[PDB]
Write a protein that binds this DNA or RNA. Structure first.
Ligand SMILES: *OP(=O)(O)OC[C@H]1O[C@@H](n2cnc3c(N)ncnc32)[C@H](O)[C@@H]1O
Ligand SMILES: [Cl-]
Ligand SMILES: [Cl-]
Ligand code: NA
Length: 600
DNA sequence: GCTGATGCGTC
DNA sequence: GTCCGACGACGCATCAGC
DNA sequence: GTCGGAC
């Protein structure tokens, strides 16, 4: 009747988490987790003696909070947690503690760590806790439920019970469990391996923490044929970046497939007669949009009769696309629509199948699965299609297909082994992807100017880790530009030393940004920085992006998709920044794509 | 309804 | 060679203040 | 989705 979690204090879990975090090496980290796990299982045998659904799940879901799927979203991140703590603790709204919580990335040695910053605010203001692990999970259920119920007052009540009955140390971990980032220094594969030799593999075919804890409760009992099951979300197979020069060797010198890389959203479909379920890339259920029955949804009523008559059970893997009925073309993922919440029509482009009736297909060759896929339903253009797998054998065909995708303004191509099996959650292992941005020289890059700064968080706390960037207005001959229009934010591509060195150089030039008193040299759209810098003191950065897309957030009216810093252009001066004219040329050069040049 | 904040999934 | 948080974009939903 | 880097 009872549960182990109802007898384990939450402080015992926090003690283990504190020992794992402070532990230096992986051996020490594993040891502390095993002591907690072994003790839990010993207690588990005693309490129950002889059915039982109880398991390590109430503790596992807090150790791996990113894997939580039963509980809905809390609706709370660092900003809301700070506001709630200010209101529940009744902090002076303009005091030092309230401003530190709301501005936890601005340093005042823990800038960028909201939990640690909250801990020091709480240490003198808080009573050692008394809640059990089950009680904590019950209160976390209440917060998620009340967020879904749109009862902010009940969130405050549920959280106030957590604050009152927990020590400052416990609340630091409760905050990390709510944010879903524990910073234990040990990966979820290591946690899984300690729990059971089959936990990782079983999680990849279920995405269900409680099923993993329930089925693999005995570390000696191992499951035999762990596989994809109907109506269970499996982690989809992924694709590694191909080395174009070695593509024939990577395909084992045999024939291979080449298919277009579609710019949609990954989605898997489970079918049993009139019952359908749809799961996203990370396992979230989107049946409400696509349709649980042939009478509801954006997709299911239009595909129900595409299937052959003898198809009772079916598991599909594909890419959800927006189809334009007028132009008979796909609208790429991004602006103006969301395929999971839609005069366009949802089109499901299928490229794999994992089950047909009483037949599991994950261990069949890709060619065999492609053969079965081509016979289990009749395609309906613009509703449900099959991704064509063009056969090829040479490196020169792959380069042609890439240039064809560049010409067609497509994202890229996929290259797959026809003899490979379906390996859930595996990157590569038969699937390769090729984009223009992977080839040196193909991309038209942008030399733009840093104009704004933002404080970092986490491992990049305490420094300006990302930046607001702008382009210049063309000045008369011999003159330098004086007005800049913001284009995009960027915060990746630099090593930590380069970010640190750039931070020391620009340190003495940052000026606090005032939205009611902006600088005249920088014209911002909706997006405002935390600090600005006058252009003459700043630095040019060379930006690689995939394309220029519309934006309501930057003064140029457009921004960059997938931007990153390729080089910090110390060899350029600030006034050598690219102008709005250079941007307009690039934007209309190839419908926004920054790839318009063939590989040779 | 609009705007700006804030959060949540996708990429 | 793998895995992860810190970053980028979006649409949509929700909220408070207007 | 990319990125550098811890592992
Ligand atoms: O960029 P990335 O590594 O996430 O690429 C993988 C994703 O690309 C999408 N996609 C589009 N077309 C295909 C085909 N034919 N096969 C496999 N994946 C494909 C998916 O969304 C995938 O997750
Ligand atoms: Cl083990
Ligand atoms: Cl939904
Ligand atoms: Na780089």
């Amino acid at each position: 009747s009872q549960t182990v979690a109802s007898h384990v204090p939450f402080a015992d879990l926090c003690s283990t988490l504190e020992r794992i975090q402070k532990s230096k090496g992986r051996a020490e980290k594993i040891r502390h987790f095993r002591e907690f796990l072994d003790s839990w299982r010993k207690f588990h045998d005693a309490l129950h003696k002889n059915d039982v659904t109880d398991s390590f799940y109430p503790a596992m879901r807090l150790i791996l909070p990113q894997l939580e799927r039963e509980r809905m979203a809390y609706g709370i991140k660092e900003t809301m947690l700070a506001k709630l703590y200010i209101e529940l603790l009744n902090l002076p709204r303009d005091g030092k503690d309230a401003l530190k919580l709301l501005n936890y990335r601005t340093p005042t040695g823990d800038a960028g760590d909201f939990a640690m910053i909250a801990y020091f605010v709480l240490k003198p203001r808080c009573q050692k806790g008394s809640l059990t692990i089950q009680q904590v999970n019950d209160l976390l259920d209440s917060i998620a439920s009340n967020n879904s119920a749109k009862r902010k007052d009940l969130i405050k009540k549920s959280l106030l019970q957590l604050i009152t009955q927990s020590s400052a140390l416990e609340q630091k971990w409760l905050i990390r469990m709510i944010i879903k980032d524990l910073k234990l220094g040990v990966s979820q594969q290591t946690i899984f391996s300690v729990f059971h030799n089959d936990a990782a593999e079983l999680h990849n075919v279920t995405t269900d923490l409680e099923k993993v804890c329930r089925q693999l409760h005995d570390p000696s009992v191992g499951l035999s044929d762990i596989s994809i099951t109907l109506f269970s979300a499996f982690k989809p197979m992924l694709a590694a970046i191909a080395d174009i020069e070695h593509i024939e060797k990577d395909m084992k010198h045999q024939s291979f497939y080449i298919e277009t890389k579609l710019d949609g959203e990954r989605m898997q479909m489970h079918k049993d007669g009139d019952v359908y379920k749809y799961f996203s890339r990370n396992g979230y259920n989107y049946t409400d949009q696509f349709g649980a029955s042939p009478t509801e949804g954006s997709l299911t009523p239009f595909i129900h009769n595409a299937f052959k008559a003898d198809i009772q059970i079916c598991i599909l893997d594909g890419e959800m696309m927006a189809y334009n009925p007028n132009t008979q073309t796909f609208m790429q993922k991004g602006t103006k629509f969301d395929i999971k919440r839609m005069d366009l029509q949802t089109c499901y482009c299928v490229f794999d199948v994992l089950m047909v009736n009483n037949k599991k297909l994950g261990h069949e060759t890709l060619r065999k699965r492609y053969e079965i896929l081509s016979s289990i339903f009749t395609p309906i253009p613009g509703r449900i299609e099959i991704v064509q797998k063009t056969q090829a054998h040479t490196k020169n065909e792959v380069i042609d297909a890439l240039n064809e995708a560049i010409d067609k303004r497509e994202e890229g191509i996929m290259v797959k082994q026809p003899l490979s099996i379906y390996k859930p959650d595996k990157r590569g292992e038969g699937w390769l992807k090729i984009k223009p941005e992977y080839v040196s020289g193909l991309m038209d890059e942008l030399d733009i100017l840093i104009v704004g700064g933002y404080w970092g968080k986490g491992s990049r706390g305490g420094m300006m880790s990302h930046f607001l960037c702008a382009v210049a207005e063309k000045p008369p001959p011999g003159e330098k530009p004086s007005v800049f229009h913001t284009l995009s934010r960027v915060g990746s591509g630099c090593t930590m030393k380069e970010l640190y060195d750039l931070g020391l150089k620009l340190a003495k030039y940052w000026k606090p940004f005032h939205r009611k008193a902006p600088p005249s040299s920088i014209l911002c759209g909706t997006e405002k920085p935390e600090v600005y810098i006058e252009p003459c003191n700043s630095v040019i950065v060379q930006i690689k992006a995939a394309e220029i897309v519309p934006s309501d957030m930057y003064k140029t009216g457009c921004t960059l998709r997938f931007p990153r810093i390729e080089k910090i252009r110390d060899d350029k001066e600030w006034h050598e920044c690219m102008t709005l004219d250079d941007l307009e040329q690039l934007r209309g050069k190839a419908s926004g794509k920054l790839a318009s040049k063939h590989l040779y």
